[PDB]
Amino acid sequence: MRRVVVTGMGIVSSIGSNTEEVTASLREAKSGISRAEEYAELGFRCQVHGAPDIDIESLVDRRAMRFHGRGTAWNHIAMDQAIADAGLTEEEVSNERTGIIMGSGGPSTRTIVDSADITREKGPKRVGPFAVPKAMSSTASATLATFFKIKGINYSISSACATSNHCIGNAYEMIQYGKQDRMFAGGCEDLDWTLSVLFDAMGAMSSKYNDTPSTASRAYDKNRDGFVIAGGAGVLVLEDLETALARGAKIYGEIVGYGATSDGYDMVAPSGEGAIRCMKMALSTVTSKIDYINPHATSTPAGDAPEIEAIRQIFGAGDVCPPIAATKSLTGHSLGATGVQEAIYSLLMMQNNFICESAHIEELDPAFADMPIVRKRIDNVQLNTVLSNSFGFGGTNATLVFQRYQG
Amino acid sequence: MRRVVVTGMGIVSSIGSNTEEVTASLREAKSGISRAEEYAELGFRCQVHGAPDIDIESLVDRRAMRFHGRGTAWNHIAMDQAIADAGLTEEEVSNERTGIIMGSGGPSTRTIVDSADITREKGPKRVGPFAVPKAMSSTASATLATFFKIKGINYSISSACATSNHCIGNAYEMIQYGKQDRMFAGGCEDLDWTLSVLFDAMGAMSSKYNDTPSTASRAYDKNRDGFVIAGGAGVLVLEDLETALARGAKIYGEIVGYGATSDGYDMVAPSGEGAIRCMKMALSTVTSKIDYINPHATSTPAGDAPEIEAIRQIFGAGDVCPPIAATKSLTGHSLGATGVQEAIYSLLMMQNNFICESAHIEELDPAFADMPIVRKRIDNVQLNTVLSNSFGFGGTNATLVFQRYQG
Numbered sequence: 074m075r076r077v078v079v080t081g082m083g084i085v086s087s088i089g090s091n092t093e094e095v096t097a098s099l100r101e102a103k104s105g106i107s108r109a110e111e112y113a114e115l116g117f118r119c120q121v122h123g124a125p126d127i128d129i130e131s132l133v134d135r136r137a138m139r140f141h142g143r144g145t146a147w148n149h150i151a152m153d154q155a156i157a158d159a160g161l162t163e164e165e166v167s168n169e170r171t172g173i174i175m176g177s178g179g180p181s182t183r184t185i186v187d188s189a190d191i192t193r194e195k196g197p198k199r200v201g202p203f204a205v206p207k208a209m210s211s212t213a214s215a216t217l218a219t220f221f222k223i224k225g226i227n228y229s230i231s232s233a234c235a236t237s238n239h240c241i242g243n244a245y246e247m248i249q250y251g252k253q254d255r256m257f258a259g260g261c262e263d264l265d266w267t268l269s270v271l272f273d274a275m276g277a278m279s280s281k282y283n284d285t286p287s288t289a290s291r292a293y294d295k296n297r298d299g300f301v302i303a304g305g306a307g308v309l310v311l312e313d314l315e316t317a318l319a320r321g322a323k324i325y326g327e328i329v330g331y332g333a334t335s336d337g338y339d340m341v342a343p344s345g346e347g348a349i350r351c352m353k354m355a356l357s358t359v360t361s362k363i364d365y366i367n368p369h370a371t372s373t374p375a376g377d378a379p380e381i382e383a384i385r386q387i388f389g390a391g392d393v394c395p396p397i398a399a400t401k402s403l404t405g406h407s408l409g410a411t412g413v414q415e416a417i418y419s420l421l422m423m424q425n426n427f428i429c430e431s432a433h434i435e436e437l438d439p440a441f442a443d444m445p446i447v448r449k450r451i452d453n454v455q456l457n458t459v460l461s462n463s464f465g466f467g468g469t470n471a472t473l474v475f476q477r478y479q480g
Numbered sequence: 481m482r483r484v485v486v487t488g489m490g491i492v493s494s495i496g497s498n499t500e501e502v503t504a505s506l507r508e509a510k511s512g513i514s515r516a517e518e519y520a521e522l523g524f525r526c527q528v529h530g531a532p533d534i535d536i537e538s539l540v541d542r543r544a545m546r547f548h549g550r551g552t553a554w555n556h557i558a559m560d561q562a563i564a565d566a567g568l569t570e571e572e573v574s575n576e577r578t579g580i581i582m583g584s585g586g587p588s589t590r591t592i593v594d595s596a597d598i599t600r601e602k603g604p605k606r607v608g609p610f611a612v613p614k615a616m617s618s619t620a621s622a623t624l625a626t627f628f629k630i631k632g633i634n635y636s637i638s639s640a641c642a643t644s645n646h647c648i649g650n651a652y653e654m655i656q657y658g659k660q661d662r663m664f665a666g667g668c669e670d671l672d673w674t675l676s677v678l679f680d681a682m683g684a685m686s687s688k689y690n691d692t693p694s695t696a697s698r699a700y701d702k703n704r705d706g707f708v709i710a711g712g713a714g715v716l717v718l719e720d721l722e723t724a725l726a727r728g729a730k731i732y733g734e735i736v737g738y739g740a741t742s743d744g745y746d747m748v749a750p751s752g753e754g755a756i757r758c759m760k761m762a763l764s765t766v767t768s769k770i771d772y773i774n775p776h777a778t779s780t781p782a783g784d785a786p787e788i789e790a791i792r793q794i795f796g797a798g799d800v801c802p803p804i805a806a807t808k809s810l811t812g813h814s815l816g817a818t819g820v821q822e823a824i825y826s827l828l829m830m831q832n833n834f835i836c837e838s839a840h841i842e843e844l845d846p847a848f849a850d851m852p853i854v855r856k857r858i859d860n861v862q863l864n865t866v867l868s869n870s871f872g873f874g875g876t877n878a879t880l881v882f883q884r885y886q887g
């Protein structure tokens with residue numbers, strides 16, 4: 074198998090519109106969560122969200138937007154950033170050896186709802202002719218593949234909150250086995266009431282912190298009460314090692330492990346044992362210690378705990394376990410985007426020699442008192458190997474491990 | 481690389497509710513297309529569809545339906561059929577070596593729209609707590625993985641009309657490279673106005689045959705005027721060869737080629753050159769002649785022709801080219817389900833020694849007069865190798881090649 078490295082990154086997040094802004098937010102534990110007035114107007118329990126703050130029309134031209142929903146527009150921006158970061162030529166973007174696996178946990182629900190509404194109000198013609206590529210589940214891959222003239226692999230994986238972890242892992246495999254030499258991998262999610270309501274109706278999102286939105290997402294806090302939804306996008310450029318070296322690429326890290334398993338248990342709640350198998354599969358090809366864990370931890374009563382038990386099973390407790398810091402306490406949960414964004418956060422922490430605080434822990438849940446959950450930012454630390462989990466509804470598990478390239 | 485075989489099949493189609501009914505429909509060129517009264521009531525131009533005729537509540541129990549949209553309910557039925565056909569034990573379904581890649585071109589648009597509507601009419605709580613798994617893009621994998629207790633790989637690929645071809649091809653790869661020994665692969669699509677309208681608004685669906693619905697889908701006919709939408713599902717059980725042989729499996733065929741490429745050209749129209757590269761990639765590992773082509777051909781003016789040119793480029797024209805018969809003339813276009821359904825039709829034709837008519841060609845388009853488009857069913861033919869194309873919006877291409885197992 075060939076070795077595979079990350080040569081460029083792009084991101085649109087609730088905690089920044091590029092990697093520099095995201096880094097600053099991570100350093101400073103600056104929350105991306107705000108009040109969602111619209112949710113209040115619609116009668117939601119949860120009235121908080123993690124909204125990007127970015128001017129799409131300034132960054133994606135009108136014709137380029139014809140087939141974009143908002144989530145895939147953010148993904149286009151992230152793609153542009155990743156291409157610029159990697160320093161790719163047009164030929165390097167568009168060739169038979171270069172593909173795309175780019176996903177979202179859902180398509181544009183707003184397109185779907187607006188189309189249904191206008192059909193009934195004004196007639197089917199008024200849907201217009203450009204809705205399918207926005208509404209289809211492959212929207213993120215189809216739009217970017219077309220616009221960037223991708224010639225190799227082109228499809229989307231979805232797996233709920235595991236989506237963009239699986240996108241990256243499958244892209245990794247493609248390169249490992251010699252089918253492609255370069256891949257754009259990642260994903261996105263729109264932020265829209267028509268999606269958020271589905272989660273509010275299940276009681277899954279935080280509602281006890283509406284009056285202090287910035288602290289509503291609080292993985293590992295005793296009084297956590299559900300996740301905070303977000304939107305955004307991320308892209309990694311992946312290359313086989315020889316390709317990267319020969320062109321003088323930047324190497325943000327090497328992908329050294331990938332796990333993908335299934336709980337076969339409950340639709341909404343994790344089993345724990347599936348996560349253990351997933352992490353072990355990712356670690357089976359890793360020779361170095363893990364220096365930092367970016368957990369799935371979404372700030373839910375039922376979710377944060379089984380993953381901690383899985384981590385304890387593999388790594389132990391206390392100082393011998395890698396430091397754990399839940400970035401979702403700052404960012405919220407961006408669904409399809411979360412895996413790739415967490416890969417980016419982890420790689421940026423590796424680049425900058427720090428581990429962020431696991432934010433908003435006002436009182437640690439005593440169930441986790443034995444674990445090295447990061448209570449204050451750790452500075453001047455050399456991270457060489459980082460692990461990130463993402464687990465999704467339907468019992469779907471994905472883990473990635475990235476390593477600092479030293480030969 | 482390991483060899484990979486198809487050991488079980490299941491299907492819910494506009495042309496039958498199981499493989500026996502589908503076979504009879506193929507033999508007899510019995511159309512699955514009917515009038516869609518609802519489309520007329522809503523003011524659509526297109527008033528035809530390919531609707532399954534199956535009693536879901538008789539085949540999937542109530543608790544089992546909690547997280548199903550209609551499309552994934554059909555997929556559950558197809559999964560049950562495939563498991564029964566393969567003769568698998570519960571242990572063979574549920575183990576770490578057995579996974580699922582199961583997709584849909586979209587999720588349940590009806591869930592999404594009904595939820596938006598009820599939110600505004602009666603409030604967010606009235607969405608109920610079970611909508612997310614229906615509405616998410618990974619619905620087909622999540623629901624089946626959970627219910628069937630799948631422990632290995634679990635995710636969905638989507639790629640518009642290529643969806644379930646890519647699902648099968650990626651599952652094939654998983655087995656080839658030794659990551660899994662058995663996979664359930666395929667996909668589904670609901671049939672619902674909230675999806676169909678998106679295509680009617682683009683002018684993509686047939687509207688000149690509303691008064692003779694059965695003949696509206698007519699690939700290669702001079703007067704074709706757009707596709708006919710359908711819903712349904714299909715599943716293949718795939719196994720590495722040694723696994724299959726050791727358990728006394730039925731072997732419907734061996735997967736011997738898989739192509740996946742990207743046009744990087746237009747969102748809706750194919751380029752042709754991408755299809756050529758895709759077919760060549762599938763054929764690069766195939767040593768025998770192709771005996772039958774199951775084309776993408778959807779009965780569109782702009783789609784049927786570039787694929788025929790791609791076929792001419794690779795195979796030639798006239799008698800030296802494999803016979804071509806477009807099953808979509810009988811079935812319509814079931815979107816996410818179409819790739820796996822066409823694999824099943826092709827395998828059933830192989831099993832039964834016939835090639836179906838390419839139906840509803842009242843006047844062949846003179847542009848295709850040089851090609852071996854099947855005008856009348858061909859009987860008593862031994863098919864050994866069959867090729868099936870599926871191409872999707874966003875320039876996404878997938879081709880599969882299946883071969884009769886003879887050692």
Ligand SMILES: OCc1cc(-c2cccs2)on1
Pocket residue numbers: 177178179180182232233234268271408409465466587612613615616617
């Ligand atoms: O298509 C709408 C939709 C999207 C999702 C999810 C995204 C990530 C986890 S579930 O759920 N419903």
Ligand SMILES: OCc1cc(-c2cccs2)on1
Pocket residue numbers: 180205206208209210584585586587589639640641675678815816872873
């Ligand atoms: O999510 C709704 C939807 C589904 C699709 C497509 C399915 C297959 C090709 S496009 O387009 N919109």
Ligand SMILES: [Cl-]
Pocket residue numbers: 338339340341626
């Ligand atoms: Cl369940």
Ligand SMILES: [Cl-]
Pocket residue numbers: 219745746747748
């Ligand atoms: Cl275009």
Ligand code: NA
Pocket residue numbers: 356357358359360
């Ligand atoms: Na190891």
Ligand code: NA
Pocket residue numbers: 367368369415461462463
């Ligand atoms: Na993570």
Ligand code: NA
Pocket residue numbers: 763764765766767
């Ligand atoms: Na060949």
Ligand code: NA
Pocket residue numbers: 774775776822868869870
């Ligand atoms: Na086909």
